[PDB]
Design an enzyme around this catalytic site. Structure first.
Site, PDB file in Angstrom:
ATOM      1  N   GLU A   1      37.444  34.838  40.305  1.00  0.00           N
ATOM      2  CA  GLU A   1      36.123  35.298  39.987  1.00  0.00           C
ATOM      3  C   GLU A   1      35.459  34.108  39.334  1.00  0.00           C
ATOM      4  O   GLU A   1      36.151  33.277  38.768  1.00  0.00           O
ATOM      5  CB  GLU A   1      36.200  36.507  39.076  1.00  0.00           C
ATOM      6  CG  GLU A   1      34.885  37.277  38.872  1.00  0.00           C
ATOM      7  CD  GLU A   1      34.260  37.769  40.159  1.00  0.00           C
ATOM      8  OE1 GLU A   1      33.531  36.963  40.783  1.00  0.00           O
ATOM      9  OE2 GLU A   1      34.454  38.949  40.537  1.00  0.00           O
TER      10      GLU A   1
ATOM     11  N   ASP B   1      40.490  39.073  41.563  1.00  0.00           N
ATOM     12  CA  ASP B   1      39.886  38.339  40.458  1.00  0.00           C
ATOM     13  C   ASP B   1      40.862  37.230  40.080  1.00  0.00           C
ATOM     14  O   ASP B   1      40.467  36.091  39.810  1.00  0.00           O
ATOM     15  CB  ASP B   1      39.512  39.264  39.261  1.00  0.00           C
ATOM     16  CG  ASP B   1      38.402  40.287  39.590  1.00  0.00           C
ATOM     17  OD1 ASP B   1      37.402  39.945  40.252  1.00  0.00           O
ATOM     18  OD2 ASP B   1      38.513  41.463  39.195  1.00  0.00           O
TER      19      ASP B   1
HETATM   20 MN   LIG Z   1      36.745  42.855  39.509  1.00  0.00          MN
HETATM   21 MN   LIG Z   2      36.074  39.863  41.669  1.00  0.00          MN
END
Ligand SMILES: [Mn+2]
Ligand SMILES: [Mn+2]
Length: 175
Positions: free
Chosen positions: A58, A86
């Protein structure tokens, strides 16, 4: 009743505001209009960066993220996720999908799990209540480490509340 675009800008990391400013502009959502979602993005991000053994996904541009995913996926024999987790966890050799909700933990979890058609992607959900949930009761992190994440959502809520901002935030989430 204060300005959320204020609070966000003067209550998150420069880094964090502008990764999320930039994450938003990419779907043509203005941070000046979409200010509750603006904060949510900043918070969700801040958390991912506190859950860091771990590679971060992310925050990167999509080009950069997808390449990151691929070298790992090529080096470990791990299935390619369809979407974009993420994080990755070198110790448990899995991708992790992080969720931070101002709703029901159980609802948000199943929404996450059913999107990604994970077999192997692990899912850790926190809320602003303490309430949390990790896939298979697997909490990955130690009671302390998760606890600091818990504390800070709390420090986000009240600081919103100090400015009349918490109320709206709380109720404006969808799927
Ligand atoms: Mn997330
Ligand atoms: Mn994400």
């Amino acid at each position: 009743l204060g300005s959320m675009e204020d609070f966000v800008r003067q209550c998150f990391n420069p880094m964090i505001v502008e990764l999320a400013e930039k994450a938003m502009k990419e779907y043509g959502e203005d941070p000046k209009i979409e200010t509750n979602k603006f904060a949510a993005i900043c918070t969700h991000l801040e958390v991912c960066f506190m859950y860091s053994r771990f590679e971060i996904i992310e925050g990167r541009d999509r080009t950069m993220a997808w390449t990151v995913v691929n070298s790992i996926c090529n080096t470990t024999g791990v299935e390619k996720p369809k979407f974009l987790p993420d994080l990755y966890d070198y110790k448990e050799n899995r991708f992790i999908e992080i969720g931070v909700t101002r709703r029901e933990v159980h609802t948000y979890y199943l929404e996450k799990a059913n999107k990604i058609k994970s077999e192997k992607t692990h899912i850790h959900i926190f809320s602003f209540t303490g309430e949390e949930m990790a896939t298979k009761a697997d909490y990955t992190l130690d009671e302390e480490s998760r606890a600091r994440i818990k504390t800070r959502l709390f420090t986000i809520r009240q600081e919103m509340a100090s400015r009349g901002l918490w109320d709206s935030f709380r109720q404006s989430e969808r799927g």
